[PDB]
Amino acid sequence: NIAANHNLENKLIIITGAGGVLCSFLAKQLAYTKANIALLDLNFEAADKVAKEINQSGGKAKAYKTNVLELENIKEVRNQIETDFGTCDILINGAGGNNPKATTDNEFHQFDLNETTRTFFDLDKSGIEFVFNLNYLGSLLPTQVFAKDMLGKQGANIINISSMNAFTPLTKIPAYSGAKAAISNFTQWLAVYFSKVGIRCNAIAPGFLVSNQNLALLFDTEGKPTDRANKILTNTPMGRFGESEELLGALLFLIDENYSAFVNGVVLPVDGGFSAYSGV
Amino acid sequence: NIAANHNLENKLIIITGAGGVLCSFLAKQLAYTKANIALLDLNFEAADKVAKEINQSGGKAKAYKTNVLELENIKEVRNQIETDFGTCDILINGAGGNNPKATTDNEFHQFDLNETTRTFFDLDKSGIEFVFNLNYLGSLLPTQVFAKDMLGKQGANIINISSMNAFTPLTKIPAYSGAKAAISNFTQWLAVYFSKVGIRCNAIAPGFLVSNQNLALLFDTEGKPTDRANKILTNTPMGRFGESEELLGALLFLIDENYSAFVNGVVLPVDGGFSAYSGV
Numbered sequence: 154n155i156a157a158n159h160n161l162e163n164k165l166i167i168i169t170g171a172g173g174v175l176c177s178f179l180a181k182q183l184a185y186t187k188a189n190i191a192l193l194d195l196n197f198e199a200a201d202k203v204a205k206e207i208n209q210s211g212g213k214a215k216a217y218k219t220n221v222l223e224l225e226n227i228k229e230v231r232n233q234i235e236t237d238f239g240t241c242d243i244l245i246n247g248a249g250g251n252n253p254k255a256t257t258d259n260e261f262h263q264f265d266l267n268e269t270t271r272t273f274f275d276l277d278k279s280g281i282e283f284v285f286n287l288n289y290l291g292s293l294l295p296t297q298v299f300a301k302d303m304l305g306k307q308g309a310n311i312i313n314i315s316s317m318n319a320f321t322p323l324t325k326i327p328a329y330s331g332a333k334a335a336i337s338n339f340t341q342w343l344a345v346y347f348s349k350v351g352i353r354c355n356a357i358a359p360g361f362l363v364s365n366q367n368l369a370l371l372f373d374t375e376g377k378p379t380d381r382a383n384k385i386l387t388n389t390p391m392g393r394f395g396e397s398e399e400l401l402g403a404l405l406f407l408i409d410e411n412y413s414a415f416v417n418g419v420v421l422p423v424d425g426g427f428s429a430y431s432g433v
Numbered sequence: 434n435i436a437a438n439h440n441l442e443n444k445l446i447i448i449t450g451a452g453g454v455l456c457s458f459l460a461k462q463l464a465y466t467k468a469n470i471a472l473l474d475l476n477f478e479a480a481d482k483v484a485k486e487i488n489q490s491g492g493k494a495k496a497y498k499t500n501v502l503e504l505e506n507i508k509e510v511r512n513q514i515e516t517d518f519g520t521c522d523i524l525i526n527g528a529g530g531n532n533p534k535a536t537t538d539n540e541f542h543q544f545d546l547n548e549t550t551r552t553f554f555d556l557d558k559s560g561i562e563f564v565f566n567l568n569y570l571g572s573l574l575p576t577q578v579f580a581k582d583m584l585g586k587q588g589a590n591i592i593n594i595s596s597m598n599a600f601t602p603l604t605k606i607p608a609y610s611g612a613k614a615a616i617s618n619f620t621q622w623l624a625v626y627f628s629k630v631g632i633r634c635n636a637i638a639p640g641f642l643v644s645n646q647n648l649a650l651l652f653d654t655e656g657k658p659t660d661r662a663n664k665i666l667t668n669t670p671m672g673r674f675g676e677s678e679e680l681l682g683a684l685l686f687l688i689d690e691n692y693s694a695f696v697n698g699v700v701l702p703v704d705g706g707f708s709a710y711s712g713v
């Protein structure tokens with residue numbers, strides 16, 4: 154495991170959205186750095202599954218039911234973590250994602266759309282708010298709580314998770330795209346804000362990844378690749394979807410001061426060349 | 434040494450501009466990956482000094498006098514390297530640099546500058562040509578020679594070296610800024626061109642670094658920064674120059690397929706936050 158190359162013994166990594174697909178994979182690999190891992194998620198059972206796997210594999214982890222949108226809940230969790238492990242060294246803001254209420258059915262408006270089609274005009278204010286809250290405030294509020302504890306600590310840093318959308322928006326998903334542009338911006342803002350007290354901030358922008366959770370979404374109901382999947386492959390030079398494991402190197406690089414002490418305020422694409430391609 | 438984390442035993446790393454400040458330092462560290470290192474430079478003595486140090490420490494290196502602008506010379510050197518080590522796995526295009534004839538004395542034009550000041554109007558065509566030749570063709574021609582050999586080799590990849598000045602240009606240095614903008618662009622072009630045959634191409638964009646060779650250029654005022662150095666420091670969030678050591682992590686990240694298999698066409702800033710800040 155390449156994570157074993159990076160000695161983070163006695164450091165505490167706090168990971169939000171830890172029960173999710175990407176973060177649960179990454180959390181399990183980060184255990185091999187010998188760090189203590191706190192797994193924060195609204196879904197305690199999902200995070201606790203990850204904690205059990207880590208502990209069974211010889212690592213050190215614990216799950217904490219947390220709502221990243223509720224500041225005083227995060228603060229309570231921070232106190233429990235202090236009892237169990239200590240205070241934060243590395244914060245990974247993994248909580249995030251999109252939802253159907255802020256997604257259109259159609260790539261483009263048209264003059265001949267079926268009445269059942271959810272268009273731009275059908276997106277609910279609360280759906281848009283939900284996406285921005287989760288993907289921006291859900292990183293900002295944990296950063297307020299845990300960065301306070303990181304102040305002054307050698308090697309402290311923050312990781313946010315951006316998206317291809319932050320570079321150029323994707324069709325159908327305006328709120329998610331806008332919120333990820335905002336978190337890319339916030340990454341740079343934080344890097345500058347904390348630049349005199351030694352907390353770096355960087356982001357990983359994954360490209361198009363596949364997992365067993367989204368595999369079925371890449372096909373229509375008859376098992377043919379969707380037009381969107383075909384467009385993704387067409388506009389990805391390496392001609393494939395990425396895998397979760399392909400984010401691990403970037404994460405280790407950015408969180409390990411021996412590798413990235415002078416790397417700060419970067420949004421690092423891991424995307425098979427997608428953002429380097431014109432389409433032509 | 435973190436380079437020892439990355440097993441490149443029996444692979445061949447070809448480094449151009451190897452006798453230079455940054456590349457000589459990085460080549461010495463890459464020897465700890467156990468790769469064979471070929472050190473290419475127009476200054477044989479400078480490259481051979483590095484080869485001797487690497488070999489004395491138990492590494493495997495050889496220097497080769499090369500002009501990266503002369504295709505037939507690069508081809509002859511490629512043949513020599515095949516005899517000594519074999520064929521290229523990883524190419525680092527480190528040859529590059531500016532020329533005083535393509536640089537102004539003044540950051541901005543004014544009326545009634547004295548005759549002695551070298552202004553925009555004094556920039557020499559041959560100096561501008563020199564900078565573009567060295568920084569763009571000086572990467573493209575070795576890539577033509579050595580990528581031919583990398584075809585079919587698992588894990589093969591190309592590294593270019595860009596600059597801050599590629600993102601927005603720096604005062605006084607139009608040609609060097611333009612040529613590095615062009616190599617950033619070429620990095621993306623190569624990534625796409627080789628994307629269906631398994632050769633990644635990425636670039637590192639070092640920010641403002643200090644070395645033994647430029648220390649007395651940055652701190653002239655005995656140990657107070659020069660006016661340019663003060664501009665750099667005030668516009669770098671981390672408030673310091675970078676060191677050669679602080680580029681190694683990024684290099685290892687990008688050249689090791691275990692870390693960066695899906696990272697392609699990226700230009701990675703290593704700059705203390707410079708690119709994330711606008712001075713306000």
Ligand SMILES: NC(=O)c1ccc[n+]([C@@H]2O[C@H](COP(=O)([O-])OP(=O)(O)OC[C@H]3O[C@@H](n4cnc5c(N)ncnc54)[C@H](O)[C@@H]3O)[C@@H](O)[C@H]2O)c1
Nearest residue numbers: 170172173174175194195196219220221248249250359362
């Ligand atoms: N999956 C991808 O391919 C991909 C690509 C680019 C970016 N991202 C981003 O990566 C991050 C993780 O994505 P994912 O697909 O693995 O997510 P996921 O949907 O699989 O999991 C998200 C996790 O966040 C939890 N969560 C939701 N609301 C919460 C809240 N208020 N407080 C605490 N926890 C909450 C959920 O319970 C869940 O466990 C997100 O920021 C996502 O936007 C994902």
Ligand SMILES: NC(=O)c1ccc[n+]([C@@H]2O[C@H](COP(=O)([O-])OP(=O)(O)OC[C@H]3O[C@@H](n4cnc5c(N)ncnc54)[C@H](O)[C@@H]3O)[C@@H](O)[C@H]2O)c1
Nearest residue numbers: 450452453454455474475476499500501528529530639642
């Ligand atoms: N030094 C920095 O802080 C910095 C910052 C950003 C980018 N860069 C870029 O990093 C790379 C190395 O920079 P450096 O400062 O260490 O350079 P350097 O001037 O110290 O060394 C450059 C090397 O290239 C060799 N060279 C010149 N012309 C050649 C030719 N035609 N064929 C073969 N070799 C030739 C030189 O002999 C020299 O050894 C360059 O591309 C530079 O543009 C450097």
